[model samples]
Target: MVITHVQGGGRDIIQYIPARSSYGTPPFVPPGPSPYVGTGMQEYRKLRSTLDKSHSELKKNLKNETLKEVDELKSEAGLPGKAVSANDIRDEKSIVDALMDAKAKSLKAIEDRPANLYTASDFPQKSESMYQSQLLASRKFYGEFLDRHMSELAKAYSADIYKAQIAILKQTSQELENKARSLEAEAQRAAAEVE
Candidate 1:
């Protein structure tokens, strides 16, 4: 028979023992209550709910922040005023290609400038140095811009994954609560039979 008793901690503890001895067989002595029962289950459920809510809010905030970050990055990078989609910056190859294309266009503009405007003998060397400086600065700026965008994308992706995990944890918590209730009912029935 199973017996349910409240400990000094005000938690339910269950113990099982044989109702009687049969022949020479001694009655069974039960072990202690399950470590997962009573307050443990309650605490788990509470923490589960807290985590679920926290993750849910995190997911929403991350979504908003990611959008804002992408928009800010696009504007800073001199992209079109329209909102940039995730696919636009999804891959490193695409970003590199875009940077190369922009650099080529900028260099072409520099090359097409009027050469006659510089009358000095050393004008060609000075112009070449200016071009090199501009190119290097542009590359540095674009690289940093891409790095920021990629970092935000990775953070957004991680938040999405954790939100999924939290959802699963919440479901498991519900399942455990139901299982505990079922076990309690069974224990109560067994205790009644032994009365």
Candidate 2:
């Protein structure tokens, strides 16, 4: 009797389909076994490690750049020289008003920069509100610009690392799929033999 090990326990007999061609010929055979079975494991691991490092570096750089950009905006607005200390702001409205004043001044400074041709007229006037909606808008726009610029910088910082990491992740996933297929094939073979 055929011996089989199923999920629960051993069995006396098992049935399986014999792989065959429609013309009853032997099953089609591949030219040879694939050689990429374990070829990429080392490279994948190496690249994965590199990717982790780069990701960390990118995070740090992004954070620093974002903070620097905000600081630069503040400095350019002349707010850095202003005596509006954080402790001076007692209420939320005052804080917002102060920020708006700074934002308008910063935009004006940027427009007045010797290299810049843009004028204050190019920007919408700051709104008169406790929230300083115009200033907040300017800050948001500036922030978006900073995000775009910093992304480009970060991309340039670790181009090689990015490439390696992408290759590793892609190849590793493919390798895992291949290994799974191999295991499935072995299982099928064993099941057939049991029958």
Candidate 3:
């Protein structure tokens, strides 16, 4: 077992990964055409940065999309905060606040690398040199990831408001029922007074 010393997320973030000794590894060492080289440190840093940027963007967009979706959901539902009773009203702030909590994620970053066999990182040295390909793949992955998340978020928020609307309608039915009963009660009271 080779003990690999770890260091550098390049900005005081430190991580180390284990590597198999040359004894069991492939014999041929390939040329490093990729800028992300230096025993894979470059690639490690690059991947970490990619993960970081993706995370920040996900959060920024999540809030933005959620804000818009809440408004849209309200527009379709008719009456934003007015549907429920005075005591039960749910403002945009309340809806979005709950969703922000429910959707929170630790997400992947320094969070993921340790999962693989290599402590330095899972990507083989050869693959690290081909980091450009992984960069492209990361781009594609986040596109789909973001799209999937936004769609799911949109629908779930709609469901929450939809449930709210459903609540109001049921309550309104009960209210209308009361009105019908009261109408007859008034007629009976008026007739008794006339006698």
Candidate 4:
């Protein structure tokens, strides 16, 4: 019989193996490349930064577009006065419908005017529901974008954590294997001296 000693949490554990066992000692398997050990962290950081910037720019653009459309609609409805604060417009649906109706009535009046006096470009065009749809679509897209990025970031970090745990296990296993080899060699030396 071959005797081996392994250390665990500062305590030694003894193990016995058959003398002619085909598997003498567990082979040392080195921990291969860890996903979190190399340029992986750098790549993750870069991608995260890019997503952050892209989301920021997208939010800014969406806000600008919404503001521009609101301004255009307000102007068309002749509510450009400072008295028309955004806070004054509590119900967005009602305000949009009212603005659209006013714009349509204004366009009809302009159309009845003498064509020679006012050109087509002189009349303000009606703001279609397309703007509201676009704004909602953009908001939804921004939310999805944020969710996707967050998920990707979380996945990357979670995977890295898992790989690190695996690396730790591999190291522990390697240490145990080394200790077992040392004990086995010492046992053989003692047996030789006794013989």
Every model's TM-score: 0.29, 0.24, 0.29, 0.27
**If the candidates were sorted by their lDDT against the true structure, best first, what order would they fall in?**
1, 3, 4, 2
Task: Residues 1-195, candidate 2: write the lDDT tens digits.
Answer: 111211111111111112233432235534543333233333333433443454555444443433343345445554552323323212222333343344344334333445421122222121113113322333222222222222322233233223333343344335445555666677789999999
**Alpha carbon lDDT of each predicted model:** 0.37, 0.34, 0.37, 0.36
Q: What is the lDDT of residue 103 in candidate 1?
A: 33
RMSD of each: 37.5, 37.0, 17.0, 41.0
Candidate 2 or 1, higher lDDT: 1
| Cα TM-score of candidate 4 | 0.27
lDDT of 3 by residue, 63-106 (tens): 34444554564565564534433322334334444333332221
**Model 1 misplaced stretches (Cα beyond 4 Å):** 1-140
Q: Which 10 consecutive positions of candidate 4 have the poorest summed lDDT?
A: 4-13
Best by lDDT: 1
Residue 79 CA error for candidate 2 (Å)? Answer: 52
| Candidate 4 ranges with C-alpha deviation above 4 Å | 1-137, 141-143
Candidates 1 and 3: which is better by lDDT?
A: 1
